[PDB]
A paper describes a structure:
(A) Overlap of X-ray crystal structures of protomers of Apo-[name], [name] co-crystallized with N-acetyl glutamate (NAG), and [name] co-crystallized with L-arginine. In the conditions used in the assay, [name] with 5% DMSO displayed a melting temperature of 48 °C. The addition of 1 mM ATP, N-acetyl-glutamate and L-arginine showed positive melting shifts of 2.0, 11.8 and 8.6 °C respectively.
The L-arginine biosynthesis pathway consists of eight enzymes that catalyse the conversion of L-glutamate to L-arginine, appears to be attractive target for anti-Tuberculosis (TB) drug discovery. The arginine biosynthesis pathway consists of eight different enzymes ([Fig fig1]) all considered to be essential for *[name]* growth *in vitro*. In this work, the ligandability of four enzymes of the pathway [name], [name], [name] and [name] is explored using a fragment-based approach. In conclusion, using a fragment-based approach, we have discovered inhibitors that bind to novel sites in [name] and [name] and to the active sites of [name] and [name], which in case of [name] show on target activity against *[name]*.
Numbering used by the authors:
A (entry chain A), D (entry chain A), F (entry chain A): 5 to 294
B (entry chain B), C (entry chain B), E (entry chain B): 6 to 294
């Protein structure tokens, strides 16, 4: 209210280059962290999805739900663990993971976005075979370890996916997918978002995180980088904290696969999506090909 | 081992019904043993792929009462039913939605998708495809609040028909928001009839764990193969409580313009093919009267 | 220098209006200092590109009175105005058309096209997109022939909406043929209102070189931020002659079904963004009453 | 009636793999022999065409009419003969052949199919220049012999043809076609069916015949083959009865030209088309590439 | 040898009629000497290609009475006419259909297709494009059964207009099934008028072996260049029997909404171009009155 | 009136080969000279455009206006000149040129054509960025000379242009266009017509001129040529009168760029367009590739 009108006009006017770049384009947004627990942040995130939609941009939301899965497994008395930052997934764990991600977490996000209109539609790789999985192992200090029904996205039905977007819908993706034999696997949502971004030819991949950005020499807070190329970023990979490794592996996968830029942004900031896309604050970390 | 001239005649006799159903919507209420027995559920999924590959447009509406009850038990959530409806607190809704959409519908989508890229899971929440209005129930003349239980109110018919025209088979979990965004749990039988009417379906099929409608249960000589809605409405107060929702659904759909509704025996492998492409006279057919 | 959390809130607060305008036509009357000052005209063109890149469909109707007068002076053509309209001989029409379509509209098309392939210049002559009917004016009760001056008569709404659906921004020069093919000059304010009504625009924006409607000009305490068409029609005979065409245009558009018309201050950089995506309460909003 | 219901269900269920393979695909069916004279067989054939149509399959019927042509020529007192299994065709014979095939035989089939709906449409290569002919000779013991206005299908308008099928029609093709100079030639219907099958990218070519199938060492009835590759089948060609040579030359042409399989089936069997397509009886003879 | 400025004016004078017919259906009844003489039939086929390549949509309905009679003679089938219609036994129908569709229509399709991929032969049997209803005739007041003779009953207008929109020229043989599937022979003049009305044709052209309508046959001073349907209905009982079907066809078409029907001299090379693109006043034009 | 009807029929019938060649095709017509000053010729030209339109042909009109520009500059007291047959173009001259061409000359032609229906739409390269310019110099006896804001057509938006034609419109093109930096240049209308003809894949380019045709040895009136190949025509280029050089450079550009034929036709003849397209008078000069 206190802000003079000519200043508001200038903020709107400065969005124009970014509206032109994104009009009619796909933007994949990986949604997770505390941005899915704080109620103000969640409603702002959903409003930003409706914002993109009402500018003619095509958002695609890919969500996680690690803590919600862990909580439900505890409530049911199912003992489990993690190893490479991935959840060890028995058939029993997979059923719970799928039921929490698609039947609880994805449902809340669909309903939050739909307070703005008939846009959000929940999907998994199972639906219309929209994408498939291949079982993956993880490295426990150089040795490859079986962790059950954990997968990487293998193939994606680009055409059917873009058909949802053509109808004016915002796909909300829960990261489960069948392999070639129909066995459904749990996929880390960061890696799935990168696979979807590459497959759909997205103009950008946004990854919400609970951090200011990428630090090259953590915990040295002077090591924070606003922009980095994939060559330099791949060298940091052995050095990074285990919590960032999927975020970086996803950025590398997307940008090496042709997505013009991927962005690690602070999901703790209200309207972080609008800040990243329509402002030139230099905030977060931008990854480009190099 | 069957002579080929006999197989040919079985196939040839399907032709009148292929003609009647080609390009038409068929709403199938799926539940009971057809959903839990492994032979029956695989045959049901195959029958959905069969309809799809004849150019027929199936729409599956599924239930999941026992699965919900089992999960509530595991989580220690005690609840009641009233007038056949589950008393739905916000906690019960969350579990119901998570079981129906994240477990039961998921099993059917995967079973159907073994045949091709056809099944898509949806609730009324998705693209606001349908809405709910809160309903009460009258237990001994008094209207009773049972929480977040709804009836299907409005349906985006155009969007639904676009889905089936694109060759998808909607697998519908019966949850939907009201006008204020509050998600309600809807009884799946009532929902299937509402969807059948809204989409202008040519048939409503209601899978049940019984041979058909008995006027004098359990006497198998009281079984009715075909009945009009007028007579069936008179029979309704006399029927066993387990059949009431099935009959109320058939009545609503057929009075709402669906040419026929069918209570069919879901214990029979390929019950959908038997009902649609054969003139066995099995189950109970409901027509307008 | 502005904190990022403040920029975010400015952007977030545009969302209700992005929703209201997405896919809708907005007719903008462009003239006055917004058309001559180099900072304002570049911001106006950028605002048209802004609307286009939000999926909104702007349609610009421009004036050019002073530019016409200047060219007539250079060519030695002496003429008059009557009742605010230019006495239009065939010679005056040729100059008016050449200045409006071949000079003024050309500047705006090029300014907008610095942002992309959007602007297309058109008069009613092109594809017979709209027609004129000759009008007279009454000066002291007597109806006076003022030559080839017209009002917008019929509009090919379907063709115009096809243009904007294709992502083009029509830049309209206000000239049009009558039923016999004779091209008339149309006052741009009256034309913008006629186009807004014909296209079913969601808003009509009228850029003016004033803060808004004053009931007691020049006293800035008589400024009206919102008014209904009934009260505004009563105020009309009392207003300064410079505001009469602006008010008559708003009245015609809103009585003709446009949800709201806006007299906004074209002296303000980005006046279009301010009006549409901000709730500053600036200018004068006209609604049906 | 006596057949138990669970058996009927199983027969229907076993059609599913073949319905999936043929849904949305073209199937060319060459119709001829006694299946066009017996009234029960003819109505069953037409019902099978309506069956395919009402499963979302796209049948294209190509018909012959050798005996009907011969009968009309006899009625008119026009003397003629055969040489390489092909009719010697003067201009006078061509006019009669065209009038009988398109104006009599094709008309009966169109009306039989249309008892089931508005599907069948009669066409020749003349109509919309749907296909052209090139004059062909035949070999009389190693010497090439002119037999008049007899042709092979040269080019086919694949796009216009598929447009008829897109409108939900079942083309009924009489095998006459103009050459490049407009001279209409009579084309053997077996060879024309193979040319149409190749041109339309058909999934299968079905050839109705008055025989159990292909015998490799006729008349040894133990030489009947249910499946044979084109390499092996081409070697039999000099050995075969003159009545089968067009059936085999058509199968070879279609399958070498990319049609996944061609089938010689017994047109004496009611609903032979349904038996072949939706049953795994192993009946008839299937030809595949080898 | 003709001066080029004269050719230019002949071409320029076609423009009003190109405008009237562009995108419109023209139904042409083809028969008589225009169908048998080799110069005339080649010019007729070329004129059909001409219309097609102007964006006009010709639909040809052809006859073949003498050809049918000749084939029946060769086959030894004796038959009669009654009231101008052929007594149609199943045997006569088979020959009529085989001659009309398998011989006469084939010649025209091939002649037209020398100019491009345009002509397609169809009867009412094909895709059930039109149906017949059995008709009798009254010979001296008594209604007489004449076998499988029909009138055009219903027409799939949408399917026919799809054909011409795809750039095809339908060549129609006048045979069609009734409601029970029985194919009837239809008089081609009556059929052409029924098709013209059903397709909303802009013109019906009826080629005839005469200069036009004579009120006092054979006196060439009784020739009528234009007449309204009211007066022409009064003249009908007075006309020679050979003109009756032509006049009854024009009356039916124009009373059924076709703007004009034309009896034109098929003995004249390029009679179709002369009628449509020239204002010679030749033939007889029938308009509503 | 005096002309017998069978002669009129034959004139119409002889148009048929040319109607078949042009149906559904683009024809670019450069309109200029006295055909834009004589009132009978102008109305005949507009009628010929409506004629083409009502035969299903797609005309595209490109117009000039040299004398009208010169007249307006004189009225305004702006001194200017020519050098290589091109107008020396200051910013001041460009503004007048654009205002006269688009706001006066193009307007008269649009209204003349529209007396026949809703067909003509005026456009410049500025509109929807339909085409761009690159500044060009001219040769003054072997030395390259800057003549201000004069351009050649550089790129053309073929798709957007054909969209206007698909709606049934006749584009009337005024030859102004921006360069890559937005600076609008004046383009010689002959060269622009050739660029548009090449870009749209036109079947023919027609250039109205005030001459009988191309003379190879002017003024020898026996040197008039009805047809010439581009190889031979390029050799004449150093010899020709300065007034024909753009006409020839345009024909060469169009035909070398793939337009099947370009035609220099006498704009002094009423209905010259119909004479050229639908008559085989051999009039004018036809240019083909060689
Ligand atoms: C394989 C794996 O770890 N999946 C994640 C899915 C959700 C997320 O990525 O946050 C899990 O927690 O089970
Ligand atoms: C309101 C209500 O009881 N809904 C059902 C939904 C499942 C079903 O109908 O089978 C329930 O058990 O919760
Ligand atoms: C009739 C009339 O006065 N037209 C205006 C057009 C321009 C404008 O409205 O600004 C004129 O000054 O000629
Ligand atoms: C060339 C030739 O023999 N044509 C065949 C056509 C019909 C058929 O193949 O059965 C004929 O009998 O004349
Ligand atoms: C019923 C009838 O007489 N039909 C006509 C068809 C041909 C025509 O009209 O020229 C006939 O002679 O058989
Ligand atoms: C660069 C140039 O000479 N343009 C031309 C445009 C019109 C025409 O070609 O006739 C001019 O006269 O200015």
């Amino acid at each position: 209210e206190a802000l003079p009108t000519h200043i508001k006009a200038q903020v709107l006017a400065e969005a124009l280059p970014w509206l032109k770049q994104l009009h009619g384009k796909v933007v994949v947004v990986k949604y997770g962290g505390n941005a899915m627990t704080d109620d103000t942040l969640r409603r702002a995130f959903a409003a930003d999805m409706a914002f993109l939609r009402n500018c003619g941009i095509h958002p695609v939301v890919v969500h996680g739900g690690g803590p919600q899965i862990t909580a439900m497994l505890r409530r049911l008395g199912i003992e489990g663990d993690f190893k490479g930052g991935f959840r060890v997934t028995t058939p029993e764990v997979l059923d719970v993971a799928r039921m929490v991600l698609f039947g609880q977490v994805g449902r809340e996000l669909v309903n939050l976005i739909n307070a703005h209109g008939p846009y959000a539609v929940g999907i998994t790789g199972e639906d219309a075979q929209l994408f498939t999985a291949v079982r993956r192992s993880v490295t426990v200090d150089g040795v490859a370890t079986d962790i059950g029904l954990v997968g990487d996205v293998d193939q994606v039905n680009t055409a059917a996916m873009l058909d949802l977007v053509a109808a004016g819908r915002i796909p909300v993706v829960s990261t489960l997918a069948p392999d070639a034999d129909g066995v459904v696997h749990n996929i880390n949502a960061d890696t799935a978002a990168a696979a979807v971004a590459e497959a759909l030819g997205a103009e950008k991949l946004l990854m919400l995180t609970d951090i200011d950005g990428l630090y090259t020499r953590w915990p040295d807070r002077d090591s924070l980088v606003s922009e980095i190329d994939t060559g330099t970023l791949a060298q940091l990979l052995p050095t990074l904290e285990s919590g960032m490794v999927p975020k970086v592996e996803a950025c590398l996968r997307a940008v090496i696969g042709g997505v013009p830029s991927a962005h690690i942004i602070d999901g703790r900031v209200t309207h972080c999506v609008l800040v990243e896309l329509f402002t030139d604050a230099g905030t977060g970390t931008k990854v480009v090909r190099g």
